[PDB]
Amino acid sequence: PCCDRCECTKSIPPQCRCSDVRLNSCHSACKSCACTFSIPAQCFCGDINDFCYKPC
Amino acid sequence: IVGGYTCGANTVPYQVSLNSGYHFCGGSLINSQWVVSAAHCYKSGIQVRLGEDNINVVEGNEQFISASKSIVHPSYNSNTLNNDIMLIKLKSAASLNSRVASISLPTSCASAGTQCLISGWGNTKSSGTSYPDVLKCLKAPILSDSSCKSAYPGQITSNMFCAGYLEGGKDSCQGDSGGPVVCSGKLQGIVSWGSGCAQKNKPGVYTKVCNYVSWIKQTIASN
Ligand SMILES: [Ca+2]
């Protein structure tokens, strides 16, 4: 899985999210891929982690 | 703080360390019993450490006071980090002196170009990790919302601003969250989030304190 736009809070632990919006899918490691109900769907991963995935 | 400088002991007397097991966020003392920090810095067991410089050595000017009340902004949204502000009431009032002092709340908002002082014990490396013993400081300007929104499309609300340097190299970083952005002696920002630290084109994002002054005052008055 990869993420191009990763942002984190500046706390310890960091709380990071991938803000990538992708058509129809999120990255392969995403546990909560939130999509619009459009055609095509725009989706982004809601997961909060203490890391960023590598760039795509 | 990446690309900053050693402040000097107790030269930022309103800076506090929030400690719950370890230092995990900063905060700003706004009167003897209240600290402003980020909502995302809420954690169990917070001890507020005032008068710190070297957070790993008792130097003799510290006051360690347990947090007694957390008041996270009622509109804080962890999904967006909008309204990323929290008040912490100290269990007992801090003793205010040269080395422990409050910072004034703003009467008006700062805007692009305002020069500020950002401080904290956060990571000093943009790549990798190095955690300082002593407090670090960074002079940084507030940036145009155009630059801020361009850097973070769809994420910058009216309660945030960016500050720092688009060229990279100077920024707040992990461990700085909740800490102060002080501009002309007023607390205008709270370290909140960003894409990494000190990366080119990715300035730090900060909670816009001036939007919360009424809520802060009402909250302190009622709690
Ligand atoms: Ca100390």
Side-chain angles (χ1 to χ4, degrees), chain A residues 5-15 17 19, chain B residues 24 78-79 155 171-172 174-177 192 194-195:
Chain A
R5 297 184 186 187
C6 187
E7 299 86 38
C8 304
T9 63
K10 291 175 177 179
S11 54
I12 308 288
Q15 299 187 51
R17 182 159 42 212
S19 59
Chain B
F24 70 89
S78 57
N79 292 333
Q155 295 180 118
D171 202 352
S172 52
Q174 275 62 222
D176 291 324
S177 270
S192 185
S195 180

Side-chain angles (χ1 to χ4, degrees), chain B residues 51-60 62 64:
Chain B
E52 286 281 8
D53 188 44
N54 187 325
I55 53 170
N56 298 126
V57 182
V58 175
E59 290 177 304
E62 302 93 340
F64 283 14

